[PDB]
Amino acid sequence: SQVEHPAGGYKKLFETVEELSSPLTAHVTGRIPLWLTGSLLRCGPGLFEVGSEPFYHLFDGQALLHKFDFKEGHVTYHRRFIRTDAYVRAMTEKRIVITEFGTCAFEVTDNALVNIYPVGEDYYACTETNFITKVNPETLETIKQVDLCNYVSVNGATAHPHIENDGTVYNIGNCFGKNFSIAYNIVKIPPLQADKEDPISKSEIVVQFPCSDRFKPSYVHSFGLTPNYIVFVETPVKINLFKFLSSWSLWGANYMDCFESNETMGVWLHIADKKRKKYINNKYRTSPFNLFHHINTYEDHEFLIVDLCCWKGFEFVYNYLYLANLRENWEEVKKNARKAPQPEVRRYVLPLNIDKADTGKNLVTLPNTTATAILCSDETIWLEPEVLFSGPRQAFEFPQINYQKYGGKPYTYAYGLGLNHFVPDRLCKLNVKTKETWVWQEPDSYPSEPIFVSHPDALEEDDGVVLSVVVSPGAGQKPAYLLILNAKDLSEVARAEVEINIPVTFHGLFKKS
Amino acid sequence: SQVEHPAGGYKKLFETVEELSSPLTAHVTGRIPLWLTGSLLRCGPGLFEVGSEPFYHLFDGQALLHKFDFKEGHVTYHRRFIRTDAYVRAMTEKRIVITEFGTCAFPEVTDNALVNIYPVGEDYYACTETNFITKVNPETLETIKQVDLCNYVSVNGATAHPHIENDGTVYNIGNCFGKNFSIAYNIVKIPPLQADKEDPISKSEIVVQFPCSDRFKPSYVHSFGLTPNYIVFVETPVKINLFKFLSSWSLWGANYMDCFESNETMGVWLHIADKKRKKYINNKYRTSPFNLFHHINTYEDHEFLIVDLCCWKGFEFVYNYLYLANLRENWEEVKKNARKAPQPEVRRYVLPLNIDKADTGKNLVTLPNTTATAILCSDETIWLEPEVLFSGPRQAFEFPQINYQKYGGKPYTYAYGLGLNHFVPDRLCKLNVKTKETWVWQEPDSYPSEPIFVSHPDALEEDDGVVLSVVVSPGAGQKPAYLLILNAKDLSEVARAEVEINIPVTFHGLFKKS
Ligand SMILES: [Fe+2]
Ligand SMILES: [Fe+2]
């Protein structure tokens, strides 16, 4: 039966907070594993208005950097606003100065509210633009702004770079690479070398994917990577670059005003040979969905297995994530989601070898899937997915795996945040082979993306903990806590309670100390 | 885990048998329910060659009519070949005379009624998918009469899957040449037997007509959906090239299979008609390509139609995989042959009845209990995505059956099915279509038939009753075949009625209470 939230406590995920001057010791219930040593670092919006000027969209609030430190079974909590140009100019001018995703200012945003990742010995907070912000992972101080356009030919880059075990970083962004035309560029940033010079200054374009519309790139949030292949999924959510420059020059546009849906193209999937740095011209096609998060991608005989969190439909899912809608009472929140895209976890299987002798047949000869790929006479390969998880307006989202050991490789387990009509209200584990699921949830508690940490000496895939930040507003209750679950079955091992609210956070990482 | 059949006992499903002169008494184990009083009547092929001339395809063998009678806890088995023209002329001439689905006769439409049996008024008719249906005596299994549906209504053929309403009304669908220069599909209605006692077939009429996606190529239609207020028809990319049968059957000899092709670009078109106002509804429902043979059930839920289907993903015709030489191969080869086939999947589609243009670009499926979507586009098409109910690698839930008398056309919870393992029937299944919970019955080296549901007379719940299935079980010191009775609640075994003779594949049938 449908879990309801009449108390409306999720509204606290979208309430402005104050930063801390120094770390705060959390109150620990249960027992934190003595092997867990390091820092959970997470990004999200923390300031949702400047004076009496509101930010309107979920992705507009000013970037706040959060840290839970684990040492010898003890936990501290800390947070500092990132000193972006967006933030600094707002504090100076006492108004909204820089246009954000869904809020026009009355200059491209560097508001780094989305994620944080390592480059070399350094860490960068990011959003999805050309500006990334160097931050100190120890003190949470802001170090510098870096403009990716100084180094490589991209207009922006996702908040979901892939990082290989040696430190190499891959990312994607749109560009004008091709003559007369839009393209998508894979950027690679090397590991730090003996010369010790900034790896960002050695950035390069590895390969370029073509675009389905000369003048309209698709919105890209993440992408797939394996040892030999790069997978890029081109959705029907398009950026109409004509609509901004028109309004930026004529009348008051934000980033959300530039999006449109292409109703006829469906989804085009694309692969590139990572090592030979070569696009492969296989025209993979399927029906329309939005995609934000790839789960994992791997090679199996000569197929790519592509596990995705999908939303069925071509309407942009971000239309449903304005703060006024997310702050509404529960009955209204559910009503608002009634015509939304339906979330579904899907496995697609892409054949690498296309034999014309098989035209009109299913090419997916693997024994352990129901995914199909049909070779048509016009050379397109039409894909049908294997559904791994699907519940009515209950999304398995913000997925995470044992990335260090299983990213890009055959795997069994994913962890995610369960969204109930867009409200984060449970944690999920999914076996992608058997479709078995496990769930943690408590009434009136709204958790964040779960981050997996392996026991250091683990040989198994799910031998470790998942960490999640939980908001638990009520009479009597501590307003928030860090939750530590056993990764085997999502049973609770400990929690670390704080006496202050913590707003929504999107992404982060655990930094082993 | 993967179930293997290295002994190859499934080959006995496709082996010829002799009819019986009178019913055999079957050997009972367990307990036959004492409220089960009636006959299980099923059809299938029983003669797979005529002398030295083979039939090639699964749907070519000559129709055999089977009967298990239940009374006071005891069981009899009987079988007689149906005396169709195809059979009678093959016996007379000692050769294949009538071209079958996948077999050309060498030196005239088939009435080889191997597929199903159903009631019209006080009569029973065996059928295939052509214009010819065969009246049979359900007590003696004697053949009574050939009936040509073209004498009565303008269809070219009619499915082996009519819907029968509680009062006896029969609805069926078939292609026709209706509109000026145009193929269409006609819904035929056969009324209940009236006070006249006049033959209901002489009162048959066309209810409504669906348009065809292609002026000259109708799609293959195997079944359709029916609710109290609506008729639902699914137009798949499997097309019949009418140019091609009249063209190729004159050169040397084509069969029916030779006429099929697959349309690569249309996907699937779904269609609805208002049943009571007898009107086509012009909503252009569209989705991705699949083969469809069996609807499971259909019902109305607020302003939506819930359409549950057994699908095969892809546009290649599934029947290409059902030639007898391939089904008789050893198990490793049977598996290899199914590698590139369409993947089976049970899908629930949800069709909005009310389309508002202010919702253009959005999902119209506002129901609380489904992940199915229907997106209204600018060109007015409605693009559907299904909710997947069951999906296993080359493991189909097929030959679906429900508690039809009480739940057909209505909200429902349970379906029963035959599980196909790379096209080999090797288990029985039950599916809760709401929770997606399944139950399975299987035994090594046992190959069952479509399960048919019979309700307990005092039934309170939808699944209060039994399912009956005919099972082939060849092997050292085993009875070669048996009637299986399972409890419909949990598919636990209730009884078997064993026989000492082989029983080949049967496709469909019914339970006639008495
Ligand atoms: Fe993300
Ligand atoms: Fe059938």
From Swiss-Prot, chain A:
<keyword id="KW-1003">Cell membrane</keyword>
<dbReference type="GO" id="GO:0003834">
    <property type="term" value="F:beta-carotene 15,15'-dioxygenase activity"/>
</dbReference>
<feature type="binding site">
    <location>
        <position position="221"/>
    </location>
    <ligand>
        <name>Fe cation</name>
    </ligand>
</feature>
<keyword id="KW-0716">Sensory transduction</keyword>
<keyword id="KW-0408">Iron</keyword>
<protein>
    <recommendedName>
        <fullName>Retinoid isomerohydrolase</fullName>
        <ecNumber>3.1.1.64</ecNumber>
        <ecNumber>5.3.3.22</ecNumber>
    </recommendedName>
</protein>
<dbReference type="InterPro" id="IPR004294">
    <property type="entry name" value="Carotenoid_Oase"/>
</dbReference>
<feature type="binding site">
    <location>
        <position position="507"/>
    </location>
    <ligand>
        <name>Fe cation</name>
    </ligand>
</feature>
<feature type="binding site">
    <location>
        <position position="293"/>
    </location>
    <ligand>
        <name>Fe cation</name>
    </ligand>
</feature>
<comment type="subunit">
    <text>Interacts with MYO7A; this mediates light-dependent intracellular transport of RPE65.</text>
</comment>
<keyword id="KW-0564">Palmitate</keyword>
<keyword id="KW-0479">Metal-binding</keyword>
<feature type="lipid moiety-binding region" description="S-palmitoyl cysteine; in membrane form">
    <location>
        <position position="309"/>
    </location>
</feature>
<feature type="modified residue" description="Phosphothreonine">
    <location>
        <position position="103"/>
    </location>
</feature>
<keyword id="KW-0413">Isomerase</keyword>
<keyword id="KW-0472">Membrane</keyword>
<dbReference type="GO" id="GO:0042574">
    <property type="term" value="P:retinal metabolic process"/>
</dbReference>
<keyword id="KW-0449">Lipoprotein</keyword>
<comment type="function">
    <text>Critical isomerohydrolase in the retinoid cycle involved in regeneration of 11-cis-retinal, the chromophore of rod and cone opsins. Catalyzes the cleavage and isomerization of all-trans-retinyl fatty acid esters to 11-cis-retinol which is further oxidized by 11-cis retinol dehydrogenase to 11-cis-retinal for use as visual chromophore. Essential for the production of 11-cis retinal for both rod and cone photoreceptors. Also capable of catalyzing the isomerization of lutein to meso-zeaxanthin an eye-specific carotenoid.</text>
</comment>
<keyword id="KW-0963">Cytoplasm</keyword>
<dbReference type="GO" id="GO:1901827">
    <property type="term" value="P:zeaxanthin biosynthetic process"/>
</dbReference>
<dbReference type="GO" id="GO:0016020">
    <property type="term" value="C:membrane"/>
</dbReference>
<feature type="lipid moiety-binding region" description="S-palmitoyl cysteine; in membrane form">
    <location>
        <position position="310"/>
    </location>
</feature>
<keyword id="KW-0007">Acetylation</keyword>
<keyword id="KW-0844">Vision</keyword>
<keyword id="KW-0443">Lipid metabolism</keyword>
<dbReference type="GO" id="GO:0050908">
    <property type="term" value="P:detection of light stimulus involved in visual perception"/>
</dbReference>
<dbReference type="GO" id="GO:0001786">
    <property type="term" value="F:phosphatidylserine binding"/>
</dbReference>
<dbReference type="GO" id="GO:0005634">
    <property type="term" value="C:nucleus"/>
</dbReference>
<dbReference type="GO" id="GO:0042802">
    <property type="term" value="F:identical protein binding"/>
</dbReference>
<keyword id="KW-0378">Hydrolase</keyword>
<dbReference type="GO" id="GO:0052885">
    <property type="term" value="F:all-trans-retinyl-ester hydrolase, 11-cis retinol forming activity"/>
</dbReference>
<feature type="modified residue" description="Phosphothreonine">
    <location>
        <position position="99"/>
    </location>
</feature>
<dbReference type="GO" id="GO:0050251">
    <property type="term" value="F:retinol isomerase activity"/>
</dbReference>
<dbReference type="GO" id="GO:0052884">
    <property type="term" value="F:all-trans-retinyl-palmitate hydrolase, 11-cis retinol forming activity"/>
</dbReference>
<dbReference type="GO" id="GO:0046872">
    <property type="term" value="F:metal ion binding"/>
</dbReference>
<dbReference type="GO" id="GO:0005789">
    <property type="term" value="C:endoplasmic reticulum membrane"/>
</dbReference>
<dbReference type="GO" id="GO:0001895">
    <property type="term" value="P:retina homeostasis"/>
</dbReference>
<dbReference type="GO" id="GO:1901612">
    <property type="term" value="F:cardiolipin binding"/>
</dbReference>
<dbReference type="GO" id="GO:0031210">
    <property type="term" value="F:phosphatidylcholine binding"/>
</dbReference>
<keyword id="KW-0492">Microsome</keyword>
<comment type="similarity">
    <text>Belongs to the carotenoid oxygenase family.</text>
</comment>
